[PDB]
Amino acid sequence: MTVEPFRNEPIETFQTEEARRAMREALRRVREEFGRHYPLYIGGEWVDTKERMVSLNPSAPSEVVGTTAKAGKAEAEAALEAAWKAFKTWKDWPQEDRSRLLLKAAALMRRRKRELEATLVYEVGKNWVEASADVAEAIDFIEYYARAALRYRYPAVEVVPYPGEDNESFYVPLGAGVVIAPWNFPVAIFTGMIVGPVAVGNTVIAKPAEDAVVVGAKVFEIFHEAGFPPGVVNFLPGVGEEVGAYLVEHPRIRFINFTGSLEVGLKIYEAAGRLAPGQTWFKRAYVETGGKDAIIVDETADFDLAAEGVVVSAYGFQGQKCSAASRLILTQGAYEPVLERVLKRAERLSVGPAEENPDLGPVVSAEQERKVLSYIEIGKNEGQLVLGGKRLEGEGYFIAPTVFTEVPPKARIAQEEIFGPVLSVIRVKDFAEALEVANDTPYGLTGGVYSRKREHLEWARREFHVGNLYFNRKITGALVGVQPFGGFKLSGTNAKTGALDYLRLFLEMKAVAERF
Amino acid sequence: MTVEPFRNEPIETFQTEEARRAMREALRRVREEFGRHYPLYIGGEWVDTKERMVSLNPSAPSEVVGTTAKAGKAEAEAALEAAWKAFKTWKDWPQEDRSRLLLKAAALMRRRKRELEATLVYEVGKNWVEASADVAEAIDFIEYYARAALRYRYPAVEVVPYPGEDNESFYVPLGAGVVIAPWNFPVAIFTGMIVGPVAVGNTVIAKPAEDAVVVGAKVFEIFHEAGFPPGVVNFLPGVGEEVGAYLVEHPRIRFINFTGSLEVGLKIYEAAGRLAPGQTWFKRAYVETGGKDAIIVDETADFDLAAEGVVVSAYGFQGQKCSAASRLILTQGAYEPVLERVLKRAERLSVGPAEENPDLGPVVSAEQERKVLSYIEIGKNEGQLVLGGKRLEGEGYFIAPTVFTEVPPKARIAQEEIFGPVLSVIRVKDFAEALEVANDTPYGLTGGVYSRKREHLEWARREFHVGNLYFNRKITGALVGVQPFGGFKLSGTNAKTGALDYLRLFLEMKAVAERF
Numbered sequence A, B: 001m002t003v004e005p006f007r008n009e010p011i012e013t014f015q016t017e018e019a020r021r022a023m024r025e026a027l028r029r030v031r032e033e034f035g036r037h038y039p040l041y042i043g044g045e046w047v048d049t050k051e052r053m054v055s056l057n058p059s060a061p062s063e064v065v066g067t068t069a070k071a072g073k074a075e076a077e078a079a080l081e082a083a084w085k086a087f088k089t090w091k092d093w094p095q096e097d098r099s100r101l102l103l104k105a106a107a108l109m110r111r112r113k114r115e116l117e118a119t120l121v122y123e124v125g126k127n128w129v130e131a132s133a134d135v136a137e138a139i140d141f142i143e144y145y146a147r148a149a150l151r152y153r154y155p156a157v158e159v160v161p162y163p164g165e166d167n168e169s170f171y172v173p174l175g176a177g178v179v180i181a182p183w184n185f186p187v188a189i190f191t192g193m194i195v196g197p198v199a200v201g202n203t204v205i206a207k208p209a210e211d212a213v214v215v216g217a218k219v220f221e222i223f224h225e226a227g228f229p230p231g232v233v234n235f236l237p238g239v240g241e242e243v244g245a246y247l248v249e250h251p252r253i254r255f256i257n258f259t260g261s262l263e264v265g266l267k268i269y270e271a272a273g274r275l276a277p278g279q280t281w282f283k284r285a286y287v288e289t290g291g292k293d294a295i296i297v298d299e300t301a302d303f304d305l306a307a308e309g310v311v312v313s314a315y316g317f318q319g320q321k322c323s324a325a326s327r328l329i330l331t332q333g334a335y336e337p338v339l340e341r342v343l344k345r346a347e348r349l350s351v352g353p354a355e356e357n358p359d360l361g362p363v364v365s366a367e368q369e370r371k372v373l374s375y376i377e378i379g380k381n382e383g384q385l386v387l388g389g390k391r392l393e394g395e396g397y398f399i400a401p402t403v404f405t406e407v408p409p410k411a412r413i414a415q416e417e418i419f420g421p422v423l424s425v426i427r428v429k430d431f432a433e434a435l436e437v438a439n440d441t442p443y444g445l446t447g448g449v450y451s452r453k454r455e456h457l458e459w460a461r462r463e464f465h466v467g468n469l470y471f472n473r474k475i476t477g478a479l480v481g482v483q484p485f486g487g488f489k490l491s492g493t494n495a496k497t498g499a500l501d502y503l504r505l506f507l508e509m510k511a512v513a514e515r516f
């Protein structure tokens, strides 16, 4: 297979009339389709259930974006049977054939990109550019993994020769596994976690997050149209603690690919270490969990550039990113100039229904709103509230951009992942103390430094202990291929997505010697 | 660093007068030192304890071959402090400097190979060639990992460029971990599991098996002379379920590298999946466990070649190998010709004190003797005893080469790892049924096929589901570099030793972007 070198899918900014027109039409058609029902997808067919999952518009939660079927244990069992049956033959497809199937799925997704973006707008309250970045990242995962998988093809392993023998080592896929996905990047992360394993010959049962079931179904429409053989990919919208846990704990699930909260990731990793009755392997579990990500700014930085990057990092998609800047660590000389600029920029941010393309749409659900507002109340007794801290008026789950300052490094709001538009500003003496504070959390996902001092940058390169570190730019929006994504510590297992190494996680190696 | 391309250390056959003379000298030196006490090695110094571990000669168990100190929880804590203190600077050594240190250790080990082999003979009952293969493999791990580590050096990761930015991804070591080692290859596996992680910048607390504490101490003499910085490698002989479990469960242990029984591997993997109080990472655990390994012979095979390979595979080091052929699966046409040849060959095998270079020495301990004899009793109830099945005269734990025939595929002796000189012979209709029987165990470590039929060999290449498969040769003695070693299913986590991939298991990746 020979294709053009990988390039990232451009993120639409909607600055041309042509792009606005296309997006307006896409939003109109998605809105016109509110209330549609999407079944499960098991063994190559759409399968309905009596029970359903309801997906609300967080900008106007009286509105039902759509419903899906709901998978329980019986549907999990049907999906397992379909996936294992498919694995038997899918594993034997030449890699080039599997990679071409991914490339077809990528082409179909690209052709439906405005529709998928519009679905994210309505279903999870992304503004237009956040929706565009999500979809472009999904396309990037497909394009990237399609190509990366060829690097593992038979027989890929470099071995030392031996006289009178052929020695051949090669990779094989593991089997049928479960993918359990978050609501915050429900096209990008959902797609990536599915297609990586599938590319190299595994089969997958995919469990979308409850708040993002409709867009998960549209991804499955694409998979079905592309023509993945029956059983290779299966779609099981349902309750995480029910069908999700059932699959995690099952003796016949080979691997678990999870992205989500630390709380859930911990349970999954523990469960994966147990031998379920009748289980005949050691389960692999990849868990990519939260962060409490900091940007450090020292007195040498471009303060205007820093303030802009902090505001993008903290408030992009309402701070509902594992990569979001939730801590701003300012050295003494940076404190006043940077905080003043951040406050000035943040107070200008618009908040409203996502379809209007505001700076911030709503948070995703009533439960998320409750948790964020609760953390705001906690924060009021830990640090100094200097901006926002309020729910805004309206049916949708609108929360104002919020800033606390003089926050103690050990405060709950400086340690725990809030996952909302809440920035905690921490004042430190110097760059050495900035690094100490940056590192002193249980997490290690993303981080940033704004500084012109080469020695501070290079020190952070060595010692700011996060998996994804950025200098003089935003700490969100890691690009597939460019920035292998994944963290340290309680940010997860360091499964680097959008990197060659990712696919090795879903392979095992055989070594076969023939003595002639 | 530029060194000669990797080659495997030649295994001494002792066919020359000089080699025999050298072995006799080494045996004499080692036995003159049977009085020796070997302390713990913690933070660059030998540290003694009140309590001790005693090591016996399994060929003459009234003879003590040495004693060592005995690590408890306090010594585990001391080793942890030392290993984490050392990690802070050892991680920052240029890879070339760490690799040179391993190369020095390999040179020192090679200079002491006869002494090490003689220690294996007396301490764990290896005959001369089994001892030589063990030491040569340890040397190989050091030479191979020294070189392989350079493939990961800063900045090793292939990433996609982005305009106006430097994007740099690179590997870093994980931290301090525990290595828990078996008695059956107590130079090779002990050395490999330590030096792989250490090569790329980790530090290690090593817990040798109780039956092989003395030879483990001698490996540490080599590490000390090579000049590993204090705390980089630590030696903690002690009780598995005490000090071993304490380290496995510890919140400050970053990774576990284990080779041993399934029973213990299951406990370790389960424990590793738990977040210990105060733990701030997801532990990595690599567990390489047992096998129930089969050789298939069909009616097209060279029956004499097959019989020789089977006897080597089944009874080499008394069958106390995770790779040992414990099942012999014969198609109808192969059954009589191969079984008659195997019986003729096996009945000629000598058994006695290991230092006399018999075909078989003793099993390693009174406990192993009890286990093997108990399985022989079970076997008498499940199949037909046709050879051996008896303890042999003398204080040493001598057990005759044993063959059961007409063994049902689901018999305990056809399913459970006996780890002694006990071969179970299974008659099957044809090659398809042979593969079915081969695959139907909880294990998947090694396997073999004797056959001249190309289609049967290539069918097995695709479908005989073991990590290390061998055609028309013995299924034991995997060579570093040549045959990446590690299995499927309950044979462990497929951490392929003696392969480039091994070192990646002890690394995490950081991605650092600078926007100019």
Ligand SMILES: NC(=O)c1ccc[n+]([C@@H]2O[C@H](COP(=O)([O-])OP(=O)(O)OC[C@H]3O[C@@H](n4cnc5c(N)ncnc54)[C@H](O)[C@@H]3O)[C@@H](O)[C@H]2O)c1
Binding pocket: A180, A181, A182, A183, A184, A185, A189, A207, A208, A209, A210, A238, A239, A240, A241, A242, A244, A245, A248, A259, A260, A261, A262, A264, A265, A267, A268, A288, A289, A290, A291, A321, A322, A323, A417, A419, A445, A486, A487, A491, A492
């Ligand atoms: N590290 C990363 O790459 C990354 C990326 C995106 C999001 N996240 C994390 O995701 C979190 C927000 O996502 P979320 O709210 O969907 O997370 P969540 O943990 O609440 O749920 C994630 C998924 O797990 C399922 N689930 C819930 N309980 C389960 C259980 N006991 N067993 C099996 N499955 C279960 C849910 O139904 C959902 O599909 C944040 O913490 C964020 O940091 C991390």
Ligand SMILES: NC(=O)c1ccc[n+]([C@@H]2O[C@H](COP(=O)([O-])OP(=O)(O)OC[C@H]3O[C@@H](n4cnc5c(N)ncnc54)[C@H](O)[C@@H]3O)[C@@H](O)[C@H]2O)c1
Binding pocket: B180, B181, B182, B183, B184, B185, B189, B207, B208, B209, B210, B238, B239, B240, B241, B242, B244, B245, B248, B259, B260, B261, B262, B264, B265, B267, B268, B288, B289, B290, B291, B321, B322, B323, B417, B419, B445, B486, B487, B491, B492
């Ligand atoms: N897969 C492989 O590469 C491979 C290679 C060699 C040996 N083995 C296996 O090794 C086994 C024989 O070795 P063994 O008898 O030394 O194995 P074992 O499991 O009894 O002990 C192995 C090591 O673990 C320690 N240990 C025992 N209980 C422990 C506990 N609960 N927690 C932590 N550590 C504990 C022991 O003290 C020893 O150091 C066989 O099953 C064989 O198949 C596997």
Ligand SMILES: CC(C)[C@H](N)C(=O)O
Binding pocket: A137, A185, A188, A189, A321, A322, A323, A475, A476, A477, A478, A479, A485
């Ligand atoms: C998907 C998400 C984690 C995105 N790649 C980011 O870094 O913000």
Ligand SMILES: CC(C)[C@H](N)C(=O)O
Binding pocket: B137, B185, B188, B189, B321, B322, B323, B475, B476, B477, B478, B479, B485
């Ligand atoms: C050390 C041991 C596992 C050896 N390499 C073998 O295959 O027998």
Ligand code: NA
Binding pocket: A055, A056, A057, A058, A065, A123, A124, A211, A212
């Ligand atoms: Na929704």
Ligand code: NA
Binding pocket: B055, B056, B057, B058, B122, B123, B124, B211, B212, B364
């Ligand atoms: Na001994």
